[PDB]
Amino acid sequence: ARSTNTFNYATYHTLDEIYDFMDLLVAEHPQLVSKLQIGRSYEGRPIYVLKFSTGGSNRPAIWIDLGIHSREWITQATGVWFAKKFTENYGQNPSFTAILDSMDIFLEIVTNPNGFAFTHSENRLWRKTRSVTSSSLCVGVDANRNWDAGFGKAGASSSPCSETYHGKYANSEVEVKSIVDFVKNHGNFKAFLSIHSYSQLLLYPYGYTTQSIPDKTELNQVAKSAVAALKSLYGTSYKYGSIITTIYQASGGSIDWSYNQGIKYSFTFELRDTGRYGFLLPASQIIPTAQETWLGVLTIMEHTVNN
Ligand SMILES: O=C(O)C[C@@H](Cc1ccccc1)C(=O)O
Ligand SMILES: [Zn+2]
C-alpha cells in the first residue's frame, strides 16, 4: 500500500491497487523499471507494460503477458509478484542477473483491464473484452482468439454471444492491436509468453494447424526442462505439448501469432489448479503458484539468453 514491501501479495487486488503498485515499484527502482503505456482499452483505461532493463540499445527482449482472460485472477496475481521478484533477484541470483544484464523484460500484468474491472464489478467469471457493437446485445471478444494466426478458422466462434467469439477481424480489439504494434515496432523480441489458468499445461504452437513447427524438438525439450523445474518446489505436475495436441485447436491465439513473427520461444502457461477450484483459486495458493511458475519461466529465459 505504502511501499512494494508492504503490498500484500497473498491476496487478490483490484485494478487501482495493481496500477498504484506499478507506480510504487517504478518509484523504488527507477534505474531498473519503467512504466510504458502502449494503449488504452475499449473503455479508455490505460494499458501498461513494465519494462525491466539495465540499459543498452534495443536489447533482445522477453515479452510476458498476464490476464488476457479477465477471470483468471491467479495470473494477474502472479504478475504482480513477478514484478517485485525481478526487482528482488537482480544482483542476488546469478542467473536472473546474467539475464537482465543482457536482455530486457516486458511485463504486461493486466492485459485486459476492462474485463478485469468487470470481474470485480459485476460478473466474476467474465473472460472476454468489453467491446460492444453491431447486430448484437452481447459484449466482448475472446482476446486470445483475436490474433492473426489462422484467424477465423475452427477453434473460434463467429457468434458474438460466444465465450470464444473471435471478433470482427484479426486485431480488432484494441487490447491486442496494442501489443501487436508494440512488439512489431520493437522488432527484437526473442521470447513471448502468455500466462493463463487453469489446468497446469505448458503449451507451444500451433493451435490453429496440425502442422508441426520446425522447432518442435527444441521447444519440446525447453518445455520439458521448464516443467521439471516448476515441479521442483511443491511437486505441481504440468503436461506439455503443442496447443492443438495438448489442449485443443484454437484459432487466433497469441503464441501462433508470435511464433509466426519469428519469435521462436513462444509459450503459453495454463497455471493451477486442475479443476478443484478452477478460476476461483484460493488466496492461499497465490504465492506458491507464483514461486513455482517462476522457476518455469526463468528456465525458458535462460534458454533464450543462451540460443
Ligand atoms: O483459456 C485458456 O486458458 C486456454 C487457452 C488455450 C490456448 C493457449 C494458447 C493459445 C491459444 C489457446 C485459450 O482457450 O485461449
Ligand atoms: Zn485463458
Side-chain angles (χ1 to χ4, degrees), residues 68-69 72 127 196-197 270:
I68 204 163
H69 288 139
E72 299 170 15
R127 168 181 172 89
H196 284 253
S197 77
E270 305 275 341

mmCIF file with all atom_site columns, all heavy atoms in Angstrom, residues 68-69 72 127 196-197 270, ligand 2:
data_model
loop_
_atom_site.group_PDB
_atom_site.id
_atom_site.type_symbol
_atom_site.label_atom_id
_atom_site.label_alt_id
_atom_site.label_comp_id
_atom_site.label_asym_id
_atom_site.label_entity_id
_atom_site.label_seq_id
_atom_site.pdbx_PDB_ins_code
_atom_site.Cartn_x
_atom_site.Cartn_y
_atom_site.Cartn_z
_atom_site.occupancy
_atom_site.B_iso_or_equiv
_atom_site.pdbx_formal_charge
_atom_site.auth_seq_id
_atom_site.auth_comp_id
_atom_site.auth_asym_id
_atom_site.auth_atom_id
_atom_site.pdbx_PDB_model_num
ATOM   1  N  N   . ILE A 1 68  ? -5.010  -11.758 -19.971 1.00 0.00 ? 68  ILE A N   1
ATOM   2  C  CA  . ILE A 1 68  ? -5.781  -11.641 -21.194 1.00 0.00 ? 68  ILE A CA  1
ATOM   3  C  C   . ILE A 1 68  ? -7.269  -12.054 -21.048 1.00 0.00 ? 68  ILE A C   1
ATOM   4  O  O   . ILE A 1 68  ? -8.134  -11.409 -21.642 1.00 0.00 ? 68  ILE A O   1
ATOM   5  C  CB  . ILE A 1 68  ? -5.112  -12.224 -22.430 1.00 0.00 ? 68  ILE A CB  1
ATOM   6  C  CG1 . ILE A 1 68  ? -5.654  -11.588 -23.696 1.00 0.00 ? 68  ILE A CG1 1
ATOM   7  C  CG2 . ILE A 1 68  ? -5.286  -13.665 -22.769 1.00 0.00 ? 68  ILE A CG2 1
ATOM   8  C  CD1 . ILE A 1 68  ? -4.686  -11.879 -24.849 1.00 0.00 ? 68  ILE A CD1 1
ATOM   9  N  N   . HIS A 1 69  ? -7.450  -13.203 -20.308 1.00 0.00 ? 69  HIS A N   1
ATOM   10 C  CA  . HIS A 1 69  ? -8.777  -13.702 -19.925 1.00 0.00 ? 69  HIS A CA  1
ATOM   11 C  C   . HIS A 1 69  ? -9.072  -13.297 -18.469 1.00 0.00 ? 69  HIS A C   1
ATOM   12 O  O   . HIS A 1 69  ? -8.356  -13.681 -17.533 1.00 0.00 ? 69  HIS A O   1
ATOM   13 C  CB  . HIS A 1 69  ? -8.817  -15.230 -20.100 1.00 0.00 ? 69  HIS A CB  1
ATOM   14 C  CG  . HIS A 1 69  ? -8.846  -15.646 -21.581 1.00 0.00 ? 69  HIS A CG  1
ATOM   15 N  ND1 . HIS A 1 69  ? -8.107  -16.722 -22.077 1.00 0.00 ? 69  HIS A ND1 1
ATOM   16 C  CD2 . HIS A 1 69  ? -9.514  -15.132 -22.651 1.00 0.00 ? 69  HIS A CD2 1
ATOM   17 C  CE1 . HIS A 1 69  ? -8.328  -16.814 -23.380 1.00 0.00 ? 69  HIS A CE1 1
ATOM   18 N  NE2 . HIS A 1 69  ? -9.162  -15.870 -23.737 1.00 0.00 ? 69  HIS A NE2 1
ATOM   19 N  N   . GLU A 1 72  ? -9.274  -15.162 -14.911 1.00 0.00 ? 72  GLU A N   1
ATOM   20 C  CA  . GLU A 1 72  ? -8.133  -15.940 -14.455 1.00 0.00 ? 72  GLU A CA  1
ATOM   21 C  C   . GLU A 1 72  ? -7.224  -15.204 -13.451 1.00 0.00 ? 72  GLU A C   1
ATOM   22 O  O   . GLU A 1 72  ? -6.020  -14.938 -13.793 1.00 0.00 ? 72  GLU A O   1
ATOM   23 C  CB  . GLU A 1 72  ? -7.326  -16.342 -15.735 1.00 0.00 ? 72  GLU A CB  1
ATOM   24 C  CG  . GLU A 1 72  ? -8.209  -17.220 -16.717 1.00 0.00 ? 72  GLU A CG  1
ATOM   25 C  CD  . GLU A 1 72  ? -7.715  -17.536 -18.148 1.00 0.00 ? 72  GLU A CD  1
ATOM   26 O  OE1 . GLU A 1 72  ? -6.484  -17.301 -18.284 1.00 0.00 ? 72  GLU A OE1 1
ATOM   27 O  OE2 . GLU A 1 72  ? -8.470  -17.953 -19.030 1.00 0.00 ? 72  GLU A OE2 1
ATOM   28 N  N   . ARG A 1 127 ? -14.595 -13.403 -18.971 1.00 0.00 ? 127 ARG A N   1
ATOM   29 C  CA  . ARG A 1 127 ? -13.477 -13.903 -19.783 1.00 0.00 ? 127 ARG A CA  1
ATOM   30 C  C   . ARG A 1 127 ? -13.109 -12.868 -20.856 1.00 0.00 ? 127 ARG A C   1
ATOM   31 O  O   . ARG A 1 127 ? -11.932 -12.715 -21.224 1.00 0.00 ? 127 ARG A O   1
ATOM   32 C  CB  . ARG A 1 127 ? -13.886 -15.215 -20.438 1.00 0.00 ? 127 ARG A CB  1
ATOM   33 C  CG  . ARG A 1 127 ? -12.933 -15.697 -21.527 1.00 0.00 ? 127 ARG A CG  1
ATOM   34 C  CD  . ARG A 1 127 ? -13.418 -16.999 -22.166 1.00 0.00 ? 127 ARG A CD  1
ATOM   35 N  NE  . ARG A 1 127 ? -12.631 -17.399 -23.335 1.00 0.00 ? 127 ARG A NE  1
ATOM   36 C  CZ  . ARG A 1 127 ? -11.533 -18.164 -23.272 1.00 0.00 ? 127 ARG A CZ  1
ATOM   37 N  NH1 . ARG A 1 127 ? -11.071 -18.620 -22.100 1.00 0.00 ? 127 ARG A NH1 1
ATOM   38 N  NH2 . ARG A 1 127 ? -10.820 -18.542 -24.340 1.00 0.00 ? 127 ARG A NH2 1
ATOM   39 N  N   . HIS A 1 196 ? -1.981  -18.052 -18.556 1.00 0.00 ? 196 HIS A N   1
ATOM   40 C  CA  . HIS A 1 196 ? -3.430  -18.275 -18.357 1.00 0.00 ? 196 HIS A CA  1
ATOM   41 C  C   . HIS A 1 196 ? -3.647  -19.103 -17.113 1.00 0.00 ? 196 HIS A C   1
ATOM   42 O  O   . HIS A 1 196 ? -2.711  -19.695 -16.590 1.00 0.00 ? 196 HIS A O   1
ATOM   43 C  CB  . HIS A 1 196 ? -4.016  -19.018 -19.570 1.00 0.00 ? 196 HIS A CB  1
ATOM   44 C  CG  . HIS A 1 196 ? -4.208  -18.112 -20.774 1.00 0.00 ? 196 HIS A CG  1
ATOM   45 N  ND1 . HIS A 1 196 ? -5.500  -17.688 -21.180 1.00 0.00 ? 196 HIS A ND1 1
ATOM   46 C  CD2 . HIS A 1 196 ? -3.323  -17.572 -21.630 1.00 0.00 ? 196 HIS A CD2 1
ATOM   47 C  CE1 . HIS A 1 196 ? -5.321  -16.929 -22.242 1.00 0.00 ? 196 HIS A CE1 1
ATOM   48 N  NE2 . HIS A 1 196 ? -4.033  -16.846 -22.525 1.00 0.00 ? 196 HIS A NE2 1
ATOM   49 N  N   . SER A 1 197 ? -4.866  -19.397 -16.810 1.00 0.00 ? 197 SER A N   1
ATOM   50 C  CA  . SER A 1 197 ? -5.144  -20.552 -15.996 1.00 0.00 ? 197 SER A CA  1
ATOM   51 C  C   . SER A 1 197 ? -6.475  -21.114 -16.525 1.00 0.00 ? 197 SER A C   1
ATOM   52 O  O   . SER A 1 197 ? -7.186  -20.365 -17.232 1.00 0.00 ? 197 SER A O   1
ATOM   53 C  CB  . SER A 1 197 ? -5.230  -20.117 -14.492 1.00 0.00 ? 197 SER A CB  1
ATOM   54 O  OG  . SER A 1 197 ? -6.460  -19.488 -14.263 1.00 0.00 ? 197 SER A OG  1
ATOM   55 N  N   . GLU A 1 270 ? -0.708  -22.499 -18.607 1.00 0.00 ? 270 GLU A N   1
ATOM   56 C  CA  . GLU A 1 270 ? -2.003  -22.573 -18.001 1.00 0.00 ? 270 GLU A CA  1
ATOM   57 C  C   . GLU A 1 270 ? -1.665  -22.945 -16.489 1.00 0.00 ? 270 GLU A C   1
ATOM   58 O  O   . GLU A 1 270 ? -1.093  -24.030 -16.271 1.00 0.00 ? 270 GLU A O   1
ATOM   59 C  CB  . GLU A 1 270 ? -2.885  -23.654 -18.645 1.00 0.00 ? 270 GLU A CB  1
ATOM   60 C  CG  . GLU A 1 270 ? -2.954  -23.384 -20.103 1.00 0.00 ? 270 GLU A CG  1
ATOM   61 C  CD  . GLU A 1 270 ? -4.032  -22.398 -20.423 1.00 0.00 ? 270 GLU A CD  1
ATOM   62 O  OE1 . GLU A 1 270 ? -4.972  -22.211 -19.538 1.00 0.00 ? 270 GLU A OE1 1
ATOM   63 O  OE2 . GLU A 1 270 ? -3.922  -21.744 -21.428 1.00 0.00 ? 270 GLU A OE2 1
HETATM 64 ZN ZN  . ZN  B 2 .   ? -7.404  -18.107 -20.749 1.00 0.00 ? 2   ZN  B ZN  1
#
